[PDB]
Design a protein around this ligand. Structure first.
Ligand SMILES: Nc1ncnc2c1ncn2[C@@H]1O[C@H](COP(=O)(O)OP(=O)(O)OP(=O)(O)O)[C@@H](O)[C@H]1O
Ligand SMILES: Nc1ncnc2c1ncn2[C@@H]1O[C@H](COP(=O)(O)OP(=O)(O)O)[C@@H](O)[C@H]1O
Ligand SMILES: [Mg+2]
Ligand SMILES: [Mg+2]
Lengths: 219, 239, 394
């Protein structure tokens, strides 16, 4: 009951959510992070119980949260200052999520990029069960991603995805897709029709986005 | 051992501690020096005291050898240790090569000390600038200045201190060959210089000369009023 | 010779203008009415026709419909809620839920749907109007101009070279450098050349008093952005709208971070803005959050550095073309004298060097007037200079 994905922000976290939304014929229900933040008091609270009220109504239904850290900031004692209403909405997310009068009718998918901000009362064991991480792609997945996004383009069979993914470390799916689009643009800059290897090689340089400063005096 | 770099490069290529030390020079009192063909003469301005106590201890003009005189500006404390090391060095030349020291040699010693002194670890650079005047062997009178970066630099005349660029404009706007005709005429040029930069021409002046074969001589405050008196007389008939 | 004769005959007809312009009726300066000779056609007809048959039709908000029957549920500003009905003059099609509708005061039934609320402080930052800065005036950074311009306008002016090639063009771009480098000035050329909605945003305007109040402004902004066909959103000084999440102990700067997270969610995740292109501009890019630095939001990362030599000489040709000068000067000496300088500083050298010609009595400035500009602006104002701790962007 209740899974949590986390990791670096480019590893693909929305992508599984829209994938599962394309898969199941359930009542999917999306949320935003600061969507449960209101100017008046208690309106986000009533908004939460309205959300789990309708999700309680549709019995085949899973609930999604994106960017949980907008509301799930760790509490703290302080005089003189400090927000409280966000902690109100977070506390009804706690109890209204799990605790008094539970159910097994809705399923929770939550997503963030950072973990240490979170109040551990929502990371307990039973509110959020399966805390899974998203690692950066090793090499073969980096070949696989640009292999995916290289589908709908005119590509001459010059390419070597093993060479490209091997000469490109430290990227994500967004940057590996960005290589595909910038190689998709430089061929139009030279007016070519298909894609060649050096187009990808220049797209690597643009995605790296280095500062140029007059450095040829090495070696 | 306080091993730390101080003088580091700016992102656009500057030395901030150096150019701040030149500002500390730029707030110092104004000193002017010229050279004659046979008698050199220089003098500091702005004695600025309470005019009711002692003063020989505040004299900002020293000698290094018989033939080398030296004045300065900036903060006072860092100057006299440079004076001490310069005296040790110029004595050590005579312990070596038998002649007296040439002014070009001793200024290369001072600037050479100051540059590596900026290059060292854990040291603010010196916050002084000096004018060094010497009539050498075979009687060729000349002078130099000393930047806080340590660039020795010859002149026919110069002026450093607070309010010195206008004084330099007066000196280029007034320096001829016949201005160095008579020695008292050159002194009248210097007193004409300080006077139109140090405002009130009272006892603030402190001039000292050298006749290229003597030691230094400081006039008592009688030729100050005498030369200033005939200066106001010549300007009075000129008006 | 007719000195008084043109005077009094001028004066009695200049007064006699007013002496019958009181007989016209232009007088009785109002408190908000109109002139008497205008609306004179709503005089007997629309006075009894736009008033006596015409209702008030108070506007409301729909909650929901229900099945098998119209039987709508209304909502109003302060009062209660009702079960209401259509008119015969409306189809049941465009009475979709969550909509404002015009409703009579007696039967309480629906007359016309309404456009939604816009919160017109968001409408204030629609630009409506264009500046005059030409890409001619942004000389020195031509490849930055090209690499920007191919992202900005080429899909908008030609949405066929990208389709027939089969690529989606990038949608996000930020601009960054030292201050005064031509970033804002470069954005003015884009607002000059384009044609779509250019909705500017200055990041400090989003700091609100209430909690989450700025996030609704973000939401309404992207809603009216989605209303248009193609739209350009401009951002400026986004360091204020967010650097990074760092929080510890007493929670500080949280309200900014919620707005920045809402900006993240409106940029990516669950149905892309589609035909909406964004454009950021900052001074220091180091503080910015890496999830905001992710491509798909900030695909292009155009650098603005100092011009090498020739960009500087070109900038002298820009800011110096329109002033009376000595003809036989050279600018290349001045660009030798300005290693590290901005186009703002070059412009200040030009606009100061003219003032040197205005000092004594001349009409055309000289090379030594330029030399009087260089040591002053560069070397006399060199104490502050604003650049070096921004070269490292700290
Ligand atoms: N390449 C250039 N050509 C002509 N003028 C320039 C150029 N670069 C800068 N300028 C001048 O510099 C001034 C500042 O421009 P702009 O406001 O874009 O600076 P900026 O790079 O946005 O830095 P800041 O954020 O501090 O304003 C402009 O008025 C412009 O006249
Ligand atoms: N196979 C893949 N693995 C990782 N990322 C991918 C893959 N395919 C596409 N992507 C990119 O990952 C992005 C998903 O972003 P995501 O990491 O969910 O952002 P955030 O986590 O900050 O919401 C998509 O925009 C897509 O371009
Ligand atoms: Mg995601
Ligand atoms: Mg700007």
């Amino acid at each position: 009951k209740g899974v949590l994905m986390y990791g670096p922000p480019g590893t693909g976290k929305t992508l599984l959510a829209r994938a599962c939304a394309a898969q199941t014929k359930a009542t999917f229900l999306k949320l935003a992070g600061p969507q449960l933040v209101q100017m008046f008091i208690g309106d986000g609270a009533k908004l939460v119980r309205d959300a789990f009220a309708l999700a309680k109504e549709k019995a085949p239904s899973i609930i999604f949260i994106d960017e949980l850290d907008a509301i799930g900031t760790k509490r703290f004692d302080s005089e003189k200052a400090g927000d409280r209403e966000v902690q109100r909405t977070m506390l009804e997310l706690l109890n209204q999520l799990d605790g008094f009068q539970p159910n097994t009718q809705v399923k929770v998918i939550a997503a963030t990029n950072r973990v240490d901000i979170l109040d551990p009362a929502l990371l307990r064991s039973g509110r959020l069960d399966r805390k899974i991480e998203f690692p950066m792609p090793n090499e073969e997945a980096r070949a696989r991603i640009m292999q995916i996004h290289s589908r709908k383009m005119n590509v001459s069979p010059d390419v070597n995805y093993e060479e490209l993914a091997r000469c490109t470390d430290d990227f994500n799916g967004a940057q590996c897709k960005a290589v595909c689009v910038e190689a998709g643009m430089i061929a139009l800059r030279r007016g070519a029709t298909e894609l060649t290897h050096e187009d990808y090689m220049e797209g690597i340089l643009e995605v790296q986005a280095k500062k140029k400063a007059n450095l040829q005096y090495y070696a | 051992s306080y091993d730390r770099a101080i003088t580091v490069f700016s992102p656009d290529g500057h030395l901030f501690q150096v150019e701040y030390a030149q500002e500390a020079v730029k707030k110092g009192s104004t000193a002017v020096g010229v050279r004659g063909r046979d008698i050199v003469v220089l003098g500091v301005e702005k004695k600025s005291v309470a005019k009711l106590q002692d003063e020989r201890t505040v004299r900002k003009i020293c000698a290094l050898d018989d033939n080398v005189c030296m004045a300065f500006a900036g903060l006072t404390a860092d100057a006299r240790i440079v004076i001490n090391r310069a005296r040790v060095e110029c004595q050590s030349h005579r312990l070596t090569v038998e002649d007296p020291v040439t002014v070009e040699y001793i200024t290369r010693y001072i600037a050479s000390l100051k540059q590596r002194y900026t290059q060292s670890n854990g040291r603010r650079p010196f916050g002084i600038s000096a004018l060094i005047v010497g009539f050498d062997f075979d009687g060729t009178p000349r002078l130099y200045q000393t930047d806080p970066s340590g660039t020795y630099h010859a002149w026919k005349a110069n002026a450093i201190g607070r309010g010195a660029k206008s004084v330099r404009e007066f000196l280029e706007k007034n320096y001829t060959d016949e201005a160095i005709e008579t020695d008292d005429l050159t002194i009248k040029l210097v007193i004409k210089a300080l006077l139109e930069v140090v405002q009130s021409g009272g006892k603030n002046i402190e001039l000292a000369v050298m006749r290229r074969d003597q030691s230094l001589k400081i006039l008592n405050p009688e030729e100050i009023e005498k030369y200033v008196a005939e200066i106001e007389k010549e300007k009075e008939e000129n008006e | 010779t007719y000195s008084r004769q043109i005077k009094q005959v001028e004066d009695d007809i200049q007064q006699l203008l007013k002496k019958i312009n009181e007989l016209t009726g232009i007088k009785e300066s109002d408190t908000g009415l109109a002139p008497p000779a205008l609306w004179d056609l709503a005089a007997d007809k629309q006075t009894l026709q736009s008033e006596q048959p015409l209702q008030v039709a108070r506007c409301t908000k729909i909650i929901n419909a229900d099945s098998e029957d119209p039987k709508y549920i209304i909502n109003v500003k302060q009062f209660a809620k009702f079960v209401v009905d259509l008119s015969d003059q409306v189809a049941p099609t465009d009475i979709e839920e969550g909509m404002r509708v015009g409703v009579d005061r007696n039967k309480y039934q629906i007359h016309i749907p309404l456009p939604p609320k816009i919160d017109p402080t968001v409408t204030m930052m629609q630009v409506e109007e264009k500046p005059d800065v030409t890409y001619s005036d942004v000389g020195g950074c031509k490849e930055q101009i090209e690499k920007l311009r191919e992202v900005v306008e080429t899909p908008l002016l030609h949405p066929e070279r990208f389709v027939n090639l089969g690529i989606e063009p990038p949608k996000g771009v930020l601009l960054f450098g030292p201050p005064g480098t031509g970033k804002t000035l470069c954005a003015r050329a884009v607002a000059n050349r384009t044609d779509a909605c250019f909705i500017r945003v200055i990041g400090s305007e989003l700091v609100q008093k209430y909690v989450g109040e700025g996030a609704r402004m973000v939401r309404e902004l992207f809603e009216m952005a989605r209303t248009k066909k193609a739209c350009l959103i401009f951002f400026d000084e986004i360091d204020a709208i967010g650097g990074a999440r760092f929080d510890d102990g007493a929670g500080g700067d949280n309200e900014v971070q919620r707005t920045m997270l809402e900006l993240i969610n409106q940029l990516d995740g669950f149905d892309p803005r589609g035909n909406i292109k964004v454009l950021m501009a900052t001074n220091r890019p180091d503080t910015l959050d890496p999830a905001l630095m992710r491509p798909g939001r900030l695909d292009r990362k155009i650098e603005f550095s100092l011009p090498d030599l020739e960009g500087r000489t070109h900038i002298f040709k820009i800011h110096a073309r329109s002033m009376s000068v000595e003809r036989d000067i050279r600018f290349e000496l001045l660009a030798r004298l300005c290693p590290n300088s901005t186009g703002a500083e070059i412009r200040s050298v030009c606009t100061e060097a003219g003032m040197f010609a205005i000092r004594a009595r001349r009409k055309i400035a000289t090379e030594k007037d330029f030399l009087e500009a260089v040591n002053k602006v560069i070397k006399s104002y060199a104490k502050f200079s604003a650049t070096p701790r921004y070269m490292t962007y700290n």
